[PDB]
Coordinates of all heavy atoms in Angstrom, one line a residue:
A1 N -5.3 20.4 -0.8 CA -4.0 20.5 -1.5 C -3.7 22.0 -1.9 O -2.5 22.3 -1.9 CB -4.3 19.7 -2.9
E2 N -4.8 22.8 -2.1 CA -4.5 24.1 -2.3 C -3.9 25.0 -1.2 O -3.2 26.0 -1.4 CB -5.8 24.8 -2.8 CG -6.3 24.4 -4.0 CD -7.8 24.9 -4.3 OE1 -8.5 25.4 -3.3 OE2 -8.2 25.1 -5.4
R3 N -3.9 24.4 0.1 CA -3.2 25.0 1.2 C -2.1 24.3 1.7 O -1.8 24.5 3.0 CB -4.5 25.1 2.2 CG -5.5 26.3 1.8 CD -6.9 26.1 2.3 NE -7.6 27.2 1.7 CZ -8.1 27.2 0.4 NH1 -8.0 26.2 -0.3 NH2 -8.9 28.2 0.0
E4 N -1.6 23.3 1.1 CA -0.4 22.5 1.3 C -0.7 21.6 2.4 O 0.2 21.1 3.1 CB 0.7 23.4 1.6 CG 0.9 24.6 0.8 CD 0.8 24.4 -0.7 OE1 1.0 23.2 -1.2 OE2 0.4 25.3 -1.4
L5 N -1.9 21.2 2.7 CA -2.3 20.2 3.7 C -2.3 18.9 3.1 O -3.4 18.3 2.8 CB -3.7 20.5 4.4 CG -3.7 21.9 5.3 CD1 -5.1 22.4 5.6 CD2 -2.9 21.8 6.6
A6 N -1.1 18.3 2.9 CA -1.0 17.1 2.0 C -1.6 15.8 2.7 O -2.0 15.1 1.9 CB 0.6 17.0 1.8
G7 N -1.5 15.8 4.0 CA -2.1 14.6 4.6 C -3.6 14.5 4.4 O -4.2 13.5 4.2
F8 N -4.2 15.9 4.6 CA -5.7 15.8 4.5 C -6.0 15.7 3.0 O -7.0 14.9 2.7 CB -6.2 17.2 5.0 CG -6.3 17.3 6.4 CD1 -5.2 17.7 7.3 CD2 -7.4 16.9 7.1 CE1 -5.2 17.7 8.7 CE2 -7.6 17.0 8.5 CZ -6.5 17.4 9.3
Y9 N -5.1 16.1 2.1 CA -5.5 15.9 0.7 C -5.4 14.3 0.5 O -6.3 13.8 -0.3 CB -4.3 16.7 -0.1 CG -3.9 15.9 -1.4 CD1 -4.8 15.9 -2.5 CD2 -2.7 15.3 -1.5 CE1 -4.5 15.2 -3.6 CE2 -2.4 14.6 -2.7 CZ -3.5 14.5 -3.7 OH -3.0 13.8 -4.9
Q10 N -4.3 13.6 0.9 CA -4.4 12.3 0.6 C -5.5 11.4 1.3 O -6.1 10.6 0.7 CB -3.0 11.7 1.3 CG -1.9 12.3 0.5 CD -0.5 11.6 0.8 OE1 -0.5 10.5 1.4 NE2 0.6 12.1 0.5
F11 N -5.9 11.9 2.5 CA -7.0 11.3 3.2 C -8.3 11.4 2.4 O -9.0 10.4 2.0 CB -7.2 11.9 4.6 CG -8.5 11.3 5.3 CD1 -8.5 10.0 5.8 CD2 -9.6 12.2 5.4 CE1 -9.4 9.6 6.3 CE2 -10.7 11.7 6.0 CZ -10.7 10.3 6.6
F12 N -8.7 12.6 1.8 CA -9.9 12.9 1.3 C -9.9 12.3 -0.2 O -10.8 11.9 -0.7 CB -10.2 14.3 1.2 CG -11.0 14.7 2.5 CD1 -10.2 15.7 3.2 CD2 -12.1 14.3 2.9 CE1 -10.8 16.2 4.6 CE2 -12.6 14.6 4.1 CZ -12.1 15.6 4.8
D13 N -8.6 12.2 -0.7 CA -8.5 11.6 -2.0 C -9.0 10.1 -2.0 O -9.7 9.6 -2.8 CB -7.1 11.7 -2.7 CG -6.9 11.2 -4.0 OD1 -7.1 11.6 -5.0 OD2 -6.4 9.9 -3.9
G14 N -8.5 9.5 -0.9 CA -8.8 8.0 -0.7 C -10.4 7.9 -0.3 O -11.0 7.0 -0.9
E15 N -10.8 8.8 0.4 CA -12.3 8.7 0.7 C -13.2 8.9 -0.5 O -14.2 8.2 -0.5 CB -12.7 9.9 1.8 CG -12.1 9.6 3.2 CD -12.4 8.3 3.8 OE1 -13.7 8.0 4.0 OE2 -11.4 7.5 4.1
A16 N -12.8 9.8 -1.4 CA -13.5 9.9 -2.7 C -13.5 8.6 -3.4 O -14.8 8.2 -3.8 CB -12.8 11.1 -3.6
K17 N -12.5 7.9 -3.5 CA -12.4 6.6 -4.2 C -13.3 5.6 -3.5 O -13.9 4.8 -4.1 CB -11.0 6.2 -4.3 CG -10.1 7.1 -5.3 CD -8.7 6.8 -5.2 CE -7.8 7.6 -6.1 NZ -6.4 7.4 -5.7
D18 N -13.2 5.6 -2.1 CA -14.1 4.7 -1.3 C -15.6 4.8 -1.5 O -16.3 3.9 -1.7 CB -13.7 4.8 0.1 CG -12.3 4.1 0.3 OD1 -11.7 3.4 -0.6 OD2 -11.7 4.4 1.5
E19 N -16.0 6.0 -1.4 CA -17.3 6.5 -1.7 C -17.9 6.0 -3.0 O -18.9 5.5 -3.2 CB -17.6 7.8 -1.4 CG -17.5 8.4 0.0 CD -18.5 7.7 1.0 OE1 -19.4 7.1 0.6 OE2 -18.0 7.9 2.3
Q20 N -17.1 6.2 -4.0 CA -17.3 5.7 -5.5 C -17.5 4.2 -5.4 O -18.5 3.6 -5.9 CB -16.2 6.1 -6.3 CG -16.6 5.8 -7.8 CD -17.8 6.3 -8.4 OE1 -18.4 7.3 -8.1 NE2 -18.3 5.6 -9.4
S21 N -16.7 3.6 -4.7 CA -16.8 2.1 -4.5 C -18.1 1.6 -3.9 O -18.8 0.7 -4.2 CB -15.7 1.5 -3.6 OG -14.4 1.6 -4.4
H22 N -18.6 2.3 -2.9 CA -19.9 2.2 -2.3 C -20.9 2.3 -3.3 O -21.8 1.5 -3.3 CB -20.1 3.1 -1.2 CG -19.1 3.0 0.0 ND1 -19.0 3.9 1.0 CD2 -17.9 2.2 0.2 CE1 -17.9 3.7 1.8 NE2 -17.3 2.7 1.3
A23 N -20.9 3.2 -4.0 CA -21.9 3.6 -5.1 C -22.0 2.3 -6.1 O -23.0 1.8 -6.4 CB -21.7 4.7 -5.9
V24 N -20.8 1.8 -6.6 CA -20.8 0.8 -7.4 C -21.3 -0.5 -6.7 O -22.0 -1.4 -7.3 CB -19.4 0.5 -8.0 CG1 -19.4 -0.7 -8.9 CG2 -19.0 1.7 -8.8
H25 N -21.0 -0.7 -5.4 CA -21.6 -1.9 -4.6 C -23.0 -1.9 -4.7 O -23.7 -2.9 -4.9 CB -21.0 -1.7 -3.2 CG -21.4 -2.8 -2.4 ND1 -20.9 -4.2 -2.5 CD2 -22.2 -2.9 -1.2 CE1 -21.4 -5.1 -1.6 NE2 -22.1 -4.1 -0.7
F26 N -23.6 -0.6 -4.6 CA -25.1 -0.6 -4.7 C -25.6 -1.0 -6.0 O -26.8 -1.6 -6.3 CB -25.7 0.8 -4.2 CG -25.8 0.9 -2.7 CD1 -24.9 1.3 -1.9 CD2 -27.1 0.6 -2.3 CE1 -25.0 1.5 -0.4 CE2 -27.2 0.7 -0.8 CZ -26.4 1.2 0.0
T27 N -25.0 -0.5 -7.0 CA -25.4 -0.7 -8.4 C -25.3 -2.4 -8.7 O -26.3 -3.0 -9.4 CB -24.7 -0.1 -9.6 OG1 -23.3 -0.6 -9.7 CG2 -24.5 1.4 -9.3
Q28 N -24.4 -2.9 -8.2 CA -24.4 -4.5 -8.2 C -25.5 -5.1 -7.5 O -25.9 -6.2 -8.0 CB -23.0 -4.9 -7.6 CG -21.8 -4.6 -8.6 CD -21.8 -5.5 -9.7 OE1 -21.6 -6.7 -9.6 NE2 -21.8 -4.9 -10.9
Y29 N -25.9 -4.5 -6.4 CA -27.1 -5.2 -5.7 C -28.3 -5.1 -6.4 O -29.1 -6.0 -6.6 CB -27.3 -4.5 -4.4 CG -28.5 -5.0 -3.6 CD1 -28.6 -6.4 -3.2 CD2 -29.6 -4.1 -3.3 CE1 -29.7 -6.8 -2.5 CE2 -30.6 -4.6 -2.6 CZ -30.8 -6.0 -2.3 OH -31.8 -6.4 -1.7
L30 N -28.5 -3.8 -7.2 CA -29.7 -3.8 -8.0 C -29.6 -4.8 -9.2 O -30.5 -5.4 -9.5 CB -29.8 -2.5 -8.6 CG -30.3 -1.4 -7.5 CD1 -30.6 0.1 -8.1 CD2 -31.6 -1.8 -6.8
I31 N -28.3 -5.0 -9.8 CA -28.1 -6.0 -10.8 C -28.6 -7.4 -10.2 O -29.4 -8.2 -10.9 CB -26.8 -6.0 -11.3 CG1 -26.5 -4.8 -12.1 CG2 -26.5 -7.4 -12.1 CD1 -24.9 -4.5 -12.4
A32 N -28.1 -7.7 -9.1 CA -28.4 -9.0 -8.4 C -29.9 -9.3 -8.1 O -30.4 -10.4 -8.1 CB -27.5 -9.2 -7.1

């Protein structure tokens, strides 16, 4: 984003959210 690469910014913004979802998926397995 700092370099105006808006498509890469949007891509990595989504990847950040997805990796967090993976982390939560693992926490749910430990609960299970």
Side-chain angles (χ1 to χ4, degrees):
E2 294 173 334
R3 288 152 184 82
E4 322 311 334
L5 294 165
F8 283 87
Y9 147 75
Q10 294 187 22
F11 175 74
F12 280 116
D13 180 82
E15 294 302 297
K17 292 170 185 166
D18 290 348
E19 294 295 345
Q20 180 63 26
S21 295
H22 304 168
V24 174
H25 183 66
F26 274 89
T27 70
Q28 287 281 301
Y29 177 65
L30 289 184
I31 290 160

